[PDB]
Amino acid sequence: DVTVVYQNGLPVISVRLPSRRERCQFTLKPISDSVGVFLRQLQEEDRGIDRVAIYSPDGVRVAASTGIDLLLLDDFKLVINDLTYHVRPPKRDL
Protein backbone atom coordinates (compact mmCIF):
# COMPACT_ATOMS: atom_id res chain seq x y z
CA ASP A 1 0.00 0.00 0.00
CA VAL A 2 0.74 3.72 0.15
CA THR A 3 0.76 4.83 3.80
CA VAL A 4 0.37 8.23 5.45
CA VAL A 5 1.81 8.61 8.97
CA TYR A 6 2.46 11.79 10.93
CA GLN A 7 6.00 12.05 12.28
CA ASN A 8 7.13 15.06 14.33
CA GLY A 9 3.84 16.72 13.38
CA LEU A 10 4.24 16.28 9.62
CA PRO A 11 2.70 13.80 7.16
CA VAL A 12 5.07 11.18 5.78
CA ILE A 13 3.87 9.37 2.67
CA SER A 14 5.60 6.07 1.86
CA VAL A 15 5.32 4.72 -1.66
CA ARG A 16 6.57 1.79 -3.69
CA LEU A 17 7.92 3.12 -6.96
CA PRO A 18 7.99 1.02 -10.15
CA SER A 19 11.76 0.81 -10.66
CA ARG A 20 12.88 -0.56 -7.26
CA ARG A 21 11.50 -2.71 -4.47
CA GLU A 22 12.68 -0.42 -1.68
CA ARG A 23 9.91 1.90 -0.54
CA CYS A 24 10.55 5.63 -0.57
CA GLN A 25 9.08 8.13 1.88
CA PHE A 26 8.11 11.72 1.13
CA THR A 27 7.77 14.20 4.00
CA LEU A 28 5.39 17.03 3.10
CA LYS A 29 4.57 20.45 4.53
CA PRO A 30 0.75 20.67 4.70
CA ILE A 31 0.70 24.45 4.96
CA SER A 32 2.87 25.20 1.89
CA ASP A 33 3.26 22.06 -0.22
CA SER A 34 0.67 21.31 -2.92
CA VAL A 35 -0.55 18.21 -4.72
CA GLY A 36 1.57 19.24 -7.71
CA VAL A 37 4.71 19.56 -5.60
CA PHE A 38 4.32 16.00 -4.30
CA LEU A 39 3.64 14.58 -7.77
CA ARG A 40 6.79 16.32 -8.98
CA GLN A 41 8.85 14.83 -6.14
CA LEU A 42 7.58 11.36 -7.11
CA GLN A 43 8.57 11.87 -10.75
CA GLU A 44 11.98 13.18 -9.73
CA GLU A 45 12.47 10.07 -7.59
CA ASP A 46 11.81 7.50 -10.34
CA ARG A 47 12.42 8.17 -14.04
CA GLY A 48 10.47 4.94 -14.69
CA ILE A 49 7.28 6.85 -13.82
CA ASP A 50 5.55 7.81 -17.06
CA ARG A 51 2.50 9.27 -15.36
CA VAL A 52 1.23 10.24 -11.93
CA ALA A 53 -2.04 11.79 -10.74
CA ILE A 54 -4.29 12.09 -7.71
CA TYR A 55 -8.05 11.59 -7.71
CA SER A 56 -10.82 11.94 -5.15
CA PRO A 57 -12.45 8.77 -3.80
CA ASP A 58 -15.27 9.43 -6.31
CA GLY A 59 -12.67 9.40 -9.10
CA VAL A 60 -12.37 13.13 -9.90
CA ARG A 61 -8.95 14.59 -10.70
CA VAL A 62 -7.54 16.79 -7.92
CA ALA A 63 -6.04 20.13 -8.96
CA ALA A 64 -2.26 20.37 -8.72
CA SER A 65 -2.55 23.71 -6.87
CA THR A 66 -4.50 22.15 -3.99
CA GLY A 67 -2.72 22.29 -0.64
CA ILE A 68 -1.49 19.07 0.94
CA ASP A 69 -3.46 20.07 4.06
CA LEU A 70 -6.72 19.90 2.06
CA LEU A 71 -5.78 16.64 0.31
CA LEU A 72 -5.14 14.89 3.63
CA LEU A 73 -8.63 15.73 4.94
CA ASP A 74 -9.95 12.52 3.36
CA ASP A 75 -9.05 9.44 1.31
CA PHE A 76 -7.64 9.79 -2.18
CA LYS A 77 -6.38 7.71 -5.08
CA LEU A 78 -2.78 7.94 -6.26
CA VAL A 79 -2.19 6.69 -9.80
CA ILE A 80 1.40 5.71 -10.67
CA ASN A 81 1.71 4.42 -14.25
CA ASP A 82 -0.88 1.62 -14.51
CA LEU A 83 -1.47 1.08 -10.75
CA THR A 84 -4.04 2.89 -8.59
CA TYR A 85 -3.51 3.12 -4.81
CA HIS A 86 -6.35 3.93 -2.43
CA VAL A 87 -4.69 6.07 0.24
CA ARG A 88 -6.37 6.52 3.64
CA PRO A 89 -4.74 9.36 5.61
CA PRO A 90 -5.40 9.74 9.35
CA LYS A 91 -8.19 12.27 9.68
CA ARG A 92 -6.98 15.39 11.51
CA ASP A 93 -8.55 18.82 12.12
CA LEU A 94 -7.17 21.24 9.47
Side-chain angles (χ1 to χ4, degrees), residues 1-19 21 23-46 48-92 94:
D1 274 348
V2 175
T3 57
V4 184
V5 174
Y6 283 74
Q7 303 192 37
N8 307 296
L10 294 178
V12 178
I13 309 190
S14 302
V15 183
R16 192 110 46 187
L17 303 162
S19 303
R21 281 316 86 64
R23 327 231 321 153
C24 196
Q25 68 171 51
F26 300 78
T27 304
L28 298 171
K29 307 187 188 180
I31 75 159
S32 56
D33 284 336
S34 65
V35 162
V37 164
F38 168 61
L39 300 185
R40 206 231 299 124
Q41 291 182 3
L42 289 173
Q43 299 179 284
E44 280 168 349
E45 194 58 27
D46 194 336
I49 288 180
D50 309 315
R51 160 208 162 81
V52 62
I54 287 177
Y55 293 77
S56 70
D58 293 347
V60 183
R61 178 86 173 261
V62 168
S65 275
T66 302
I68 284 303
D69 57 341
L70 299 175
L71 174 69
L72 299 184
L73 294 176
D74 186 15
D75 300 353
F76 61 99
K77 300 185 269 177
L78 172 65
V79 176
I80 306 184
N81 287 352
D82 58 336
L83 294 183
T84 298
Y85 300 95
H86 186 191
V87 191
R88 303 185 297 117
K91 272 71 230 201
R92 285 160 76 113
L94 184 270

